[PDB]
Structure formats: structure tokens, C-alpha cells
Nucleic acid binder design. Structure first.
Ligand SMILES: [Mg+2]
Ligand SMILES: [Mg+2]
Ligand SMILES: [Mg+2]
Ligand SMILES: [Mg+2]
Ligand SMILES: [Mg+2]
Ligand SMILES: [Mg+2]
Ligand SMILES: [Mg+2]
Ligand SMILES: [Mg+2]
Ligand SMILES: [Mg+2]
Ligand SMILES: [Mg+2]
Ligand SMILES: [Mg+2]
Ligand SMILES: [Mg+2]
Ligand SMILES: [Mg+2]
Ligand SMILES: [Mg+2]
Ligand SMILES: [Mg+2]
Ligand SMILES: [Mg+2]
Ligand SMILES: [Mg+2]
Ligand SMILES: [Mg+2]
Ligand SMILES: [Mg+2]
Ligand SMILES: [Mg+2]
Ligand SMILES: [Mg+2]
Lengths: 68, 208, 157, 169, 294
RNA sequence: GUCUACGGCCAUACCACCCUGAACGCGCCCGAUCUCGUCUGAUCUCGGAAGCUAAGCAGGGUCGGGCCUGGUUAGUACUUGGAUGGGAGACCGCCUGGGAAUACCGGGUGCUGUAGGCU
RNA sequence: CCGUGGAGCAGAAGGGCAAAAGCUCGCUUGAUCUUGAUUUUCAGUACGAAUACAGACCGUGAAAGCGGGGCCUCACGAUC
RNA sequence: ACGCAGUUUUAUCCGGUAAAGCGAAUGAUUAGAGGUCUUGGGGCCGAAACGAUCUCAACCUAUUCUCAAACUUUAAAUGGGUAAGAAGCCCGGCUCGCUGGCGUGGAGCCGGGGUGGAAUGCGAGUGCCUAGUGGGCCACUUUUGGUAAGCAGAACUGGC
């Protein structure tokens, strides 16, 4: 009652029935896995960007609109 | 002794005597030179060698029988110390045997189908030289007849060629007598040493 | 039944080739590995700590994370189902740069300089990389000598 | 007519290899203490014989290296015992020579009844200014070819100083 | 006839390294001293390299790039008579002096002169360099011992002490300075200040002037043949540290050239080599023609 | 035209032998009282400066051994794809493309960064 | 004195290693506690093993740094 | 114009098979020559003596014969990954509790400038539910075991 054990015949033809797909697109890539000390940098940097970017960038926009 | 009809042209990877075999018996042939072993280079001018045509395996017992037949014809033709024969081929491939009936079905099927080492054969490429005989200039036909007698005993189809080279060395017989006397080649027993010009000057000072 | 452990076929691949057995050079360390850098993977037998796997040798990936004395690389590995982007942590000794992206940035800088010259001087420059064109109707020279007659040699063993 | 290339006494080795450990080896270390005025150092295995009873990691031999004027004095005592007559095969091909003595009380030692009669190996090496190159930790360089000490230079040194005899037989 | 010494050993000989065959590196310590952690991506790692040679000590601070090592500042021992120390150029006192000169010259190059004065009064205490907030921070550097064995009393630690008292924030321990007892764990600062000022070699000069003047005339000759007396040495190093701290600017030499050059033999050409071989061939054939008859 | 300290390239830069080295510099060297660790100041540390380039070191040379590079081997051994090609088979030949290595011979044997000093 | 791994690295082999990962000496348990991520067989599930991290207490070292077991490849186990 | 490809090209890495070699490491293996260090066996000068010498073995040197799926200096063809742009460059400025000589470095955020950036073909992405399948075979080429099989077992592609 010996049977055929293992083969990879008729496998690439099944693979190319659907055109094997790259993930091909991740705009603004996934962030998990990166260094937790770098995350402790980046989250506080982002929320203080939300806090204190207003007036200096506003005056810089006024200055660059006056210059050009 | 199984016939040579079941051990023939190459089908397996080379399986030599090594750390992994450990069970091969001794080969049939042990010696390879039968003529004047201590001959010089200038004694026997010409040589004839035996070229294979089929990519086959030659057995050590066939090499034994062929060197015995060639030695017998050489000592009948040109006598003792009138020739120098060298079997260029060396057996290293070890065949395997799967013996049975050891008249019943009740010993083993194809359960463990691995072979014990039976004998030693030699894989021969197309154009590889089997034997080479160096002799005098007057013994041209006798080398041809000896290799013809060995042709009927080796299996397959193979041809003969009287070499352009001066015996076993890789240098030409036309340039030999013009070049061994002046500068380069010095005899070293039966072999020939070729000296380049990229040596220390002390060798050239010891020469000349 | 091949007993798929780790590095079961690496008698030659994780070895130093010839006249290179010894301590590692320091220019392997003294490199700039930032995010987005396209790097290659080449295994080293000297440092037995952070070699990736026998499957990722010779592959090419993108850097996402950099740490104290290693780096993090995403690699498109092909398996039975579909190719997958996989996040690996590889040490610095196993990783070199890829010169293909540097050559592409050199070509982009040359295209920018030629585009600035085109906007300055009104010259249509044909900045697209065309492939190898067919040869034009050029002209040969055979003066002084007749063309040499060749015939095949006879067979000599 | 030779710039500062003078052969000198680099060191002097003292070795006693006792066939067993314990009292006789301790008294041999006491003899080397009586010669040198400093403590010896013991030796050990890398071979086990069993034909006479030594084991692995036993104190088999005592040895001591002496340098300087004390080395010159013990060399003077050894050449006084041999009466300045070496043989030709004592000189090695590297320029160093050993001879060894028996009856260590001949060196000028009052014989004690408790110690016994020991023999003592004498091995002399020769030195030149510039042999610290292969020994210093920073730049371990070669000695050289015109600087190394040879058989002929060693035997002519022993002919010149101390008035020695070659004994070619 | 004996051994099979060198047939393919020259063909399979793997050379170690250029600097290792010269005997100047080890790289088992350099691979951990030099290489910066990759979280910073550009930040240079500053290393004070202190090398001791006969008649000259060298104190530098350098970092690494892939093309080589970039030296920011460098001090030497042969420039100490310009600052006051005429003789005694390879002692613990000149090691501390060269370390202080290197630290002051580095901070003069960076422009951090008015802040971070360091330890002015040399006492030999464990005055570690602190960082003042609201100001540019301290200079973080790390030692290089090289191939020298680090034992208590090695003057690479004296150059370290000079750097720390000059104001370089280098982490170190107090159990490798000279004066640290090997059995008792306490450290003595008076012995260390004494060994900085060099009062022990003053006591040895007193020992030579009292016991045997033959050795005092044999060695220490440049000392007594310009001037050395211990009260002037104790005042001399004290004035030399202030002479360092008042002017570390490193005035240079013009040197420009007197352009003349013939010292070294050049290589001979291929045709010249082959014609030397041909002259050897012709001379040996002339010898075979002549000496066989004569 | 050079050397020293740290190096990058890791034998075009190693090994054997023979010559050359003016000025700095490198060293061998002169000795253990303090710091130091050993049987031994031989090794490591400590304060030098009476000699020397004999050695280390820097150059040059050996029809030098190795290394690298280039011809020959060689469009040869191999090889993607093809045939109702040959041959009983063993293998071999052709179309289209790619195409390696040893003996043999010729050429080289260090290039450079930072900082510092001598003609 | 020559000595490029021709020895040794606990064991079967392969890779790697010379002021070393080998031998000797001095201290020490980082063979510690905790949360995530990734690789390996893979269905991209688990176990086991491993890697880079992060937070405490530390050991060694002059410091750089190294160490959360064995130079790496195996030496081990679900519900109740 | 967004984008994709069982494809090629342009650059960039990766491998260790075919081949070839072992006068190159490891393992085998053949024969001759030269040399004198060494012990082992014969012979001569002869009380005996490395006192001298003939012969042999081993060793070394330079050669030479033949190989290795579990050897390799070298090293193919075929093959695998990546890039061939607006998600890409350049300029200016804020934030950071990460890092730190330095407004030093690195990440994030904001504003502005120019899209004609290899060939060929194709209009693409994505979600849910589920049947059947889980006994295969044959053919060129590369191979494992066996003497061989219409035998048993693998790789690519094609067919039943
Ligand atoms: Mg089935
Ligand atoms: Mg393989
Ligand atoms: Mg160290
Ligand atoms: Mg003392
Ligand atoms: Mg003491
Ligand atoms: Mg001394
Ligand atoms: Mg000289
Ligand atoms: Mg010298
Ligand atoms: Mg030379
Ligand atoms: Mg040469
Ligand atoms: Mg084909
Ligand atoms: Mg040696
Ligand atoms: Mg092993
Ligand atoms: Mg090995
Ligand atoms: Mg160590
Ligand atoms: Mg931690
Ligand atoms: Mg092959
Ligand atoms: Mg259904
Ligand atoms: Mg089948
Ligand atoms: Mg069946
Ligand atoms: Mg059909």
C-alpha cells in the first residue's frame, strides 16, 4: 500500500493561475517594530508639533509671502 | 563473479574508496609498469597509445588480463627489457552488488536496496588513453599488434595512435633531438625536467 | 525529511572564500545606514550572532529600523502562496550598500542638470535612456591589404 | 672594529628533574635556593610514563633562571667544575650550549647529611644588544640574519673568553 | 632532508594585517573603542590616543571616518621647553603637563576658554567634569591605552589626569592612578599630588647626592648640566601649568623649504634589469672561455 | 625625496639572503628608589641620554619563491532553447545564444587621509 | 629556532576563531525580573530554539563596551 | 495619464553545480631520478673502531600516472533579488522628554518650485460565501536505488 509521498509537480502552474501578487503599495509605511526609544522621541515630538508650530510658521509664511 | 554485461557504461556518481566505503576488497591490478622500469629517455624513441572512443567503464580484471596478454606478446616479440608499457588508467570507482537467494522468496524483498562493494572499475572518458608502450624505432609494428591483441579483450570500440610526442613526455619528437642538447631539457630518469628562464641564476651557473 | 533546522545547506555559503580568514575590516562598520536605504544581505561566518537565515542570502531589502549595533530590514521573500514583506533584524557585519540606487541617483542628477540646461538654452536633449540602437550605415576601410582568405584546417588527432 | 656587537650572558637555566614528588624534590628546591638566594619554580605533566611512577600534574622538576652577575658567577663555578673543557656537540646550532654537572657540593656548598647528593643542569644562552625585539609586547620583530648567533661564533667565543678547549673527539 | 618546511605555505599564507604585522594595533580593543552605536548616524566618537615612545609622548584626540582617522587636536612633548619644562620630558609630570596642554589647546580651538576651567589648583582629587545647563556641554572623550599594559602608575593615566583637570569629561576610576594601595581599598590624594609634582624623583636626586655621586654624575646629566634643583622643580611645574593656561594657541613654524633633494636610490627599469642579467650571462660565458684554459 | 602617531585598502604591500640610511624621529641601550608585577627589572611599569645604526625600522637588489594582472590553453571543455538529426546502445554531429580553468609566456610589486618635524 | 590553524574550542559532523571564540589567572552570577516585536517548521497556527530592542537591579573593565547561558547549527512537551 | 507583467534590456549584488585542478590545503594512488641525515639487514680492508668504503630501507628534493556525491585555488551557462521617479529631487523654517562641544546628528511637522524620465503588451484594485480535490500516470532534459524493467522514488516544463 505504498503511495507517492511528496512532490512539487503541478505547483507553479497553480501559482500562476492568479498572477502572484506583491503587496506593492504601502503609502505611509507601518510603524510598529521600530525602536521604543525612537518612539518615545517621535510621539512627544509630534504632540509638541501639534502644540507649538503655530506662530513661528505663521510669521515665516508672512515673511516668505512678503519676499516672494 | 557477475558478467560485464551488467556493469557497463556510466550511470552513477563516482563512489571511490574513502572514509565512507570501508568495505571494498582489493583491486585485481597492483602494478602498472612491466617493461624496463629503469629505462632512460633516449633509449626508446617512439610510443604507441590506445585511445578510447566510447564513454565506458573498464574493469580491473579486464585491465589485468590485457596487461598480461600485452606483456606476453612483448616478451615474445622484443624480449625482456626491450619495451616499456604503462597502464595509464587507474581503477577508483567501486560498483555495488545486491545479491539474493541467500531458491525461495522468504529472505528479503527490495527492503534495503543498498549494495555491498563488489569490485573496482574505472570510468573512461572519450579520448582518454588506456595504455601506452614506448619502444625502439624498429618495434613499430609490434606495438600495433600488441594493442590489437588487447583490443579484442577490452570491451567496446577503441582506436590506436602512435604519438607525435617523444614517449611519455609532452614534448615533440621533432624538437626533442634539436632541443635537449642545446639549452633546456635535462633527462631525469624516465621523466624529463623542463626548466623555464624564470629561475635563480645558480641553476644556470650549475649548468653549462 | 531533510530535517529543516537552521542552516542545513550552508557548508559553502556562510564561509569566507580564500585569504580572508581573520578579523573583520572596520569599513564594514563605518558606514551610514539610514531609513529607506536599499541594502543587500551577505552572510558572514565570523560573527555568529545576527546572521538572518540561509534563505535571505543574496537578497535585497529596505531599511526601516536602525539600532545600536544592528539594523532592521524588510525583505520580499517568496514562499508557496505569495511573496511577503518580512521584517528582519540583521547585524551590521552582514549588510553592505547597493550601488544600483546610487547609480540611479547619479542618472537623476544628470537628468536634472540636462533639464536645467534645456530650460536655459532651448535645446531638446532627449533625456530618456534609449536602449542599444541598431547600427547605422557606417563605412569600412580595407586599403593596403587584400582581405585574408581563410579555409578550415584538416583533422589531425 | 666592531660596533657594540658583543656576546654576553643573557640568562642561565638551572634544572633538576627528580623522578618523584615530595621530599627529594623539595630538597632539590632547597638546593636551588642555596645557590640562587631566590625561590625556584616547579614543573608538571604533558606526559605520563607509569614505568617508574609519575602521574599527571605532579611536581617533577624544579627550575630557575638566573641573569646578570650571579649568572656569571654560577657559570664560572660550572666551568670550574668542568675545568673549562667542553665538547663540540654541547654547542647547539643556535649558538647556545649546555653541559650540566653532578656532585653539586663541588660548587662550594657545605654538604648537609639530610639533603643528599644531587646533580644540576647548566644551560647557557648567549646574548647581544637587541634581543628584546622578539620579547617586547609592542613591536615583536625578527632578530635578523647578520645578527643571530651561530655555532662557529659560539665556539670561537668560548675559545676567546675563559680559555676553553673544544674536544673534537 | 628533514622537514617539508615551505612549499605551498607561501601560497596559502593568510597575512594578518599591515598594522598588526608592524606591531602597532590589536583591533580586539579597537573594534569596541572606535565604533559608534548606529542610533546617531553621524556622531563622531572622540578618543584620546596617548602613545609613549623613547624621548617623546604623544597625546591626541581623534575620531574615525571610512577614509581614515581625523585628528582634531594634538600635543607633544618636544614643545614643552616653549611652555617652561626644559628637561624631564618623559615623566609622569610631563604626562600630566601634556594632557593639560592638549585639553587647553582643544578648548582653545573650540572656543570654550572662559567656561570649564577644570581643576586649577592641582590637588589630585576625583574632580570629574560636570556639565553646566544653559551653556555648551562638556567634551566627552574616551581613552586609548593601545598595546601598553594598564597597571597602576602608567602615565597614560597621568595624561588622563591632565585631560580631566583640563576639563575633558572622560569617565574613569580612581583605582588605577598611582598612589592607590593594592591591598587596602582607600586612595590617597597626597601621594598622587606628590607624584604629579615629582617630589619622589627629587627625593631620588637627594638619594643620589647623599649616597653615591658617581651615579648622580652618570645619569641625570642634562639636568645638572643646564640646571635642576628640587625647589626650582616644584616652582617650575607650578609656573608651567599657568604658562600653559595663559597661552595654548600653538604658534607654528614657517619651515617653508630649501628645495634640494637627493637621498634615496630610485628603482631600476626593466631594460636595465634585463641588461644586468645579460651582462651576467656574457661575463659567465667569458669566464667559461677564459678560466678553462688558464 | 622622507619619518613619527592614529588609520582606510589587506600579501602589487608576506618569506629567505645581500647592500644603503645624511637631519629630525623610531629604537637598541644605562639602572631599580618610589607606581608596578615576575624564579629572574627577561616581559610590563619608573627618572634618564654615555654610544650605535650591528639589529628592529625605511629604501634598493635577487634571470628569487609566492600575490595580482594580461596573452596562450580556447571559441576548447561545458551550457539555455530545437529537430520525424545519426547511432542497436554508448554517445556524437548541426541551428540559435552564453562561454571557464592548469601547465607555457610576459609585466608589476605599494596607493593614500588626518595631525606633527626634519633636508 | 621554524611553526596560518595542520591543535584546542564537552560530546556526530559542517562553518568560524591566533596579542582569538584556544590555555592560565583575578572577581562575579546577566543561567536575574518584566512588557511588546521579528526569524525559524509553517497554514504564515502553536511548542522548542534564536535575534534586535525597551524598562529595573547588576557583574567585569581604567573606560569603550560586553553579558539577560554554553562561538553558531538540536539537545526538548498542549487541555484538565 | 494611475498602475500591472511566468518578458527583455540597462546597472547592481548573490551562489559553488557543469567544467578544471591536486608539480595547491584534505583523502587516495603510480613509476623513475638525485642527495646523503638516520637507524634496520648483507659484504670488504681486520683483534675492533660514525677509521674508510660497496649495497638496501626510510626521509627529503624536483618531477611524473590516475581520480574524489560527503575535496578544492579558479569558475561557467542557466537562475534569484533590487532600482528604472511626482510616494521622486531641491530650498527655507518649527518640534523633540532621542542624541549631544556646537542651530551637532537623526526623525516628525509646515510652505514653495518645476512631472516629457527604458522596450513591449494589458484597463486595475478589493471584500464575502462555497462545491469538488486530498489513489495519479506518461514524455525530452538533470538524477537517486537496482543488473534491468511497462520497477520504485525526486527537479523544470508539457500532455493524458
Ligand atoms: Mg497521495
Ligand atoms: Mg551544495
Ligand atoms: Mg585591551
Ligand atoms: Mg623593589
Ligand atoms: Mg612588590
Ligand atoms: Mg634592562
Ligand atoms: Mg645595516
Ligand atoms: Mg637598526
Ligand atoms: Mg625587497
Ligand atoms: Mg618572481
Ligand atoms: Mg543542450
Ligand atoms: Mg618563533
Ligand atoms: Mg569541527
Ligand atoms: Mg575545520
Ligand atoms: Mg583577550
Ligand atoms: Mg537592559
Ligand atoms: Mg566534475
Ligand atoms: Mg457540493
Ligand atoms: Mg516512477
Ligand atoms: Mg506503482
Ligand atoms: Mg491532449
Amino acid at each position: 500500500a505504498k503511495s507517492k509521498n511528496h512532490t512539487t509537480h503541478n505547483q507553479s502552474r497553480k501559482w500562476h493561475r492568479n498572477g502572484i501578487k506583491k503587496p506593492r503599495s504601502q503609502r505611509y509605511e507601518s510603524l510598529k517594530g521600530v525602536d521604543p526609544k525612537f518612539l518615545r522621541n517621535m510621539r512627544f515630538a509630534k504632540k509638541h508639533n501639534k502644540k507649538g508650530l503655530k506662530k513661528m510658521q505663521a510669521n515665516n509664511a508672512k515673511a516668505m509671502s512678503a519676499r516672494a | 563473479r557477475r558478467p560485464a554485461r551488467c556493469y557497463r557504461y556510466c550511470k552513477n556518481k563516482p563512489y571511490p574508496k574513502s572514509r565512507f566505503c570501508r568495505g571494498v576488497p582489493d583491486a585485481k591490478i597492483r602494478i602498472f609498469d612491466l617493461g624496463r622500469k629503469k629505462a632512460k629517455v633516449d633509449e626508446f624513441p617512439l610510443c604507441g597509445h590506445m585511445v578510447s572512443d566510447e564513454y565506458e567503464q573498464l574493469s580491473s580484471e579486464a585491465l589485468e588480463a590485457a596487461r598480461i596478454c600485452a606483456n606476453k606478446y612483448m616478451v615474445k616479440s622484443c624480449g625482456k627489457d626491450g619495451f616499456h608499457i604503462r597502464v595509464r588508467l587507474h581503477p577508483f570507482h567501486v560498483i555495488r552488488i545486491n545479491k539474493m537467494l541467500s531458491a525461495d522468496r522468504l529472505q528479503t524483498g527490495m527492503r534495503g536496496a543498498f549494495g555491498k562493494p563488489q569490485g573496482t572499475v574505472a570510468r573512461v572518458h572519450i579520448g582518454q588513453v588506456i595504455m601506452s608502450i614506448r619502444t625502439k624505432l624498429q618495434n613499430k609494428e609490434h606495438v600495433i599488434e600488441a594493442l590489437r591483441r588487447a583490443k579484442f579483450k577490452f570491451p567496446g570500440r577503441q582506436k590506436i595512435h602512435i604519438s607525435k610526442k617523444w614517449g611519455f613526455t609532452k614534448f615533440n619528437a621533432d624538437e626533442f633531438e634539436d632541443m635537449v642538447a642545446e639549452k633546456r631539457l635535462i633527462p631525469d630518469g624516465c621523466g624529463v625536467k623542463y626548466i623555464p628562464n624564470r629561475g635563480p641564476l645558480d641553476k644556470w651557473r650549475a649548468l653549462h | 525529511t531533510n530535517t529543516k533546522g537552521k542552516r542545513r545547506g550552508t557548508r559553502y555559503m556562510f564561509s569566507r572564500p580564500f585569504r580572508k580568514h581573520g578579523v573583520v575590516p572596520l569599513a564594514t562598520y563605518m558606514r551610514i545606514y539610514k531609513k529607506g536605504d536599499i541594502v543587500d544581505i551577505k552572510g558572514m561566518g565570523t560573527v555568529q550572532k545576527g546572521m538572518p537565515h540561509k534563505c535571505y542570502h543574496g537578497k535585497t531589502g529596505r531599511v526601516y529600523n536602525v539600532t545600536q549595533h544592528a539594523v532592521g530590514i524588510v525583505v520580499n521573500k517568496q514562499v508557496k502562496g505569495k511573496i511577503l514583506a518580512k521584517r528582519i533584524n540583521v547585524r551590521i557585519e552582514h549588510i553592505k550598500h547597493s550601488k544600483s540606487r546610487d547609480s540611479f541617483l547619479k542618472r537623476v542628477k544628470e537628468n536634472d542638470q540636462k533639464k536645467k540646461e534645456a530650460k536655459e538654452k532651448g535645446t531638446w536633449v532627449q533625456l530618456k535612456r534609449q536602449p542599444a540602437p541598431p547600427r547605422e550605415a557606417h563605412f569600412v576601410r580595407t586599403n593596403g591589404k587584400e582581405p585574408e582568405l581563410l579555409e578550415p584546417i584538416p583533422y589531425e588527432f | 672594529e666592531n660596533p657594540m656587537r658583543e656576546l654576553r650572558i643573557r640568562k642561565l637555566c638551572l634544572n633538576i628533574c627528580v623522578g618523584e614528588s615530595g621530599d627529594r624534590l623539595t630538597r632539590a628546591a632547597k638546593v636551588l635556593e642555596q645557590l640562587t638566594g631566590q625561590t625556584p619554580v616547579f614543573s608538571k605533566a604533558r606526559y605520563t610514563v607509569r614505568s617508574f611512577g609519575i602521574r599527571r600534574n605532579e611536581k617533577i622538576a624544579v627550575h630557575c633562571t638566573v641573569r646578570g652577575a650571579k649568572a656569571e658567577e654560577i657559570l664560572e663555578k660550572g666551568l670550574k667544575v668542568r675545568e673549562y673543557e667542553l665538547r663540540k656537540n654541547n654547542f647547539s646550532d643556535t649558538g647556545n650550549f649546555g653541559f650540566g654537572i653532578q656532585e653539586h657540593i663541588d660548587l662550594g656548598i657545605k654538604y648537609d647529611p639530610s639533603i643528599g647528593i644531587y646533580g644540576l643542569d647548566f644551560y647557557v644562552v648567549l646574548g647581544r644588544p637587541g634581543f628584546s625585539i622578539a620579547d617586547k609586547k609592542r613591536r615583536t620583530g625578527c632578530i635578523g640574519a647578520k645578527h643571530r648567533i651561530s655555532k662557529e661564533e659560539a665556539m670561537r667565543w668560548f675559545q676567546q673568553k675563559y680559555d676553553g678547549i673544544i674536544l673534537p673527539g | 632532508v628533514k622537514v617539508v618546511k615551505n612549499k605551498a605555505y607561501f601560497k596559502r599564507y593568510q597575512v594578518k594585517f599591515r598594522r598588526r604585522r608592524e606591531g602597532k594595533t590589536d583591533y580586539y580593543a579597537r573594534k569596541r573603542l572606535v565604533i559608534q552605536d548606529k542610533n546617531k548616524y553621524n556622531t563622531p566618537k572622540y578618543r584620546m590616543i596617548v602613545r609613549v615612545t623613547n624621548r617623546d609622548i604623544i597625546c591626541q584626540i581623534a575620531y574615525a571616518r571610512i577614509e581614515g582617522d581625523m585628528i582634531v587636536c594634538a600635543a607633544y612633548a618636544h614643545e614643552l621647553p616653549k611652555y617652561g619644562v626644559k628637561v624631564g620630558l618623559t615623566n609622569y609630570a610631563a604626562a600630566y603637563c601634556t594632557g593639560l596642554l592638549l585639553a587647553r589647546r582643544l578648548l582653545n580651538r573650540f572656543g570654550m576658554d572662559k567656561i570649564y576651567e577644570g581643576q586649577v589648583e592641582v590637588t589630585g582629587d576625583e574632580y570629574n567634569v560636570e556639565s553646566i545647563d544653559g551653556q555648551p556641554g562638556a567634551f566627552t572623550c574616551y581613552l586609548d591605552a593601545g598595546l601598553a599594559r594598564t597597571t597602576t602608575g602608567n602615565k597614560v593615566f597621568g595624561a588622563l589626569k591632565g585631560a580631566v583637570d583640563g576639563g575633558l569629561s572622560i569617565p574613569h576610576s580612581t583605582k588605577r592612578f598611582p598612589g592607590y594601595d593594592s591591598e587596602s581599598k582607600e586612595f590617597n590624594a597626597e601621594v598622587h599630588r606628590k607624584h604629579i609634582m615629582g617630589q619622589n624623583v627629587a627625593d631620588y636626586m637627594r638619594y643620589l647626592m647623599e649616597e653615591d655621586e658617581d651615579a648622580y654624575k652618570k645619569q641625570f646629566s642634562q639636568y645638572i648640566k643646564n640646571s635642576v634643583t628640587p625647589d626650582m622643580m616644584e616652582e617650575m611645574y607650578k609656573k608651567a601649568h599657568a604658562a600653559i593656561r595663559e597661552n595654548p594657541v600653538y604658534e607654528k613654524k614657517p619651515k617653508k623649504e630649501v628645495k634640494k633633494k637627493r637621498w634615496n636610490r630610485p628603482k631600476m627599469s626593466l631594460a636595465q634589469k634585463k641588461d644586468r642579467v645579460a651582462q651576467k650571462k656574457a661575463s659567465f660565458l667569458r669566464a667559461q672561455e677564459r678560466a678553462a684554459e688558464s
